[PDB]
Amino acid sequence: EDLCVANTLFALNLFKHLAKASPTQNLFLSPWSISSTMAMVYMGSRGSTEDQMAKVLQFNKIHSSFRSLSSAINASTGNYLLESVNKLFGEKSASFREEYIRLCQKYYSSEPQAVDFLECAEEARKKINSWVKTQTKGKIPNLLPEGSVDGDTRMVLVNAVYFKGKWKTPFEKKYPFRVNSAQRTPVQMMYLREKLNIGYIEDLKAQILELPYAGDVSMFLLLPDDVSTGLELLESEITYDKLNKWTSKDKMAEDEVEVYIPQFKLEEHYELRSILRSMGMEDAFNKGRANFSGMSERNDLFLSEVFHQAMVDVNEEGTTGRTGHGGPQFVADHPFLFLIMHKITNCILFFGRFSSP
């Protein structure tokens, strides 16, 4: 059994919806981080709000599942740095349900902390952003933008995730990248010739390549064979069934592969209310209709927004005489999707679209 299936189904549906807002530009997010945060919100939801969140998050034992998956993601390894941490910041004068606070700590280890939103909201925002910055080793410095919290803010539920790994085999830093039918942009390429898992997903007309990090985390890249990015078919037809078949432990066949991928860095910020609403999570965001009585007996809360910020920096860092070129090539000189997979849990930690150097 794939123990991360709900989260993966959500990750893919979320990507499809986000792509409606952003169909062609670079995209990057951590579906894991979002699922975790939303799970903590779900714990406080009731009535129709709850029923819709369960549908959207693909839950149709959830909390014990997150705790177990989180434990596996956080396991000490020696091979890379990988940390996922949740946090709850609550208005100091507010009275939340004792069982909500207890259960959120039990299953999410969110170390519930009081802050002063009512009178010092800007100070509270700075503190929250500083906490995330620390957790992300400086990589996500200002998660919550100006105006995101105010005197009516009652609780901010946070997840931070951080990953730093080295490739099992280092690349060599070696050029035109095809952005669309009217644009080519020079990019620094990285080259590797190594025994790697490579296949082809006919239903998506795309090559898939696995690049392992040291340890049980890998990057999978999906590269299509339109006059825009070339990703229309792949993005519209990708599903859990089609993808999981190919990311599964032993489907693919290892071969000597010559790989060229760009060296790249992405940094993207999102506000997900519109997206989550479109996916079916309406009542949570409806000031009138939301039911978060699980958080507060007074039933006086609603979800105002969900902020997400994610970054990635891909480089050559890892742990002669060959001249033939008869075998597989994977030349990522045009737009591709990629994902960073925790192999033990089968959870997607990060997912993106690289289309514009």
């Binding site: 951590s30 919100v41 009516d152 901010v156 995730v161 979800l303 910020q309 994610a310």
Partner: peptide
Amino acid sequence: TEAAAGTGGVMTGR
């Protein structure tokens, strides 16, 4: 690869 992310869900009073 170095990768990181944050998510923040804001609950507001009404």
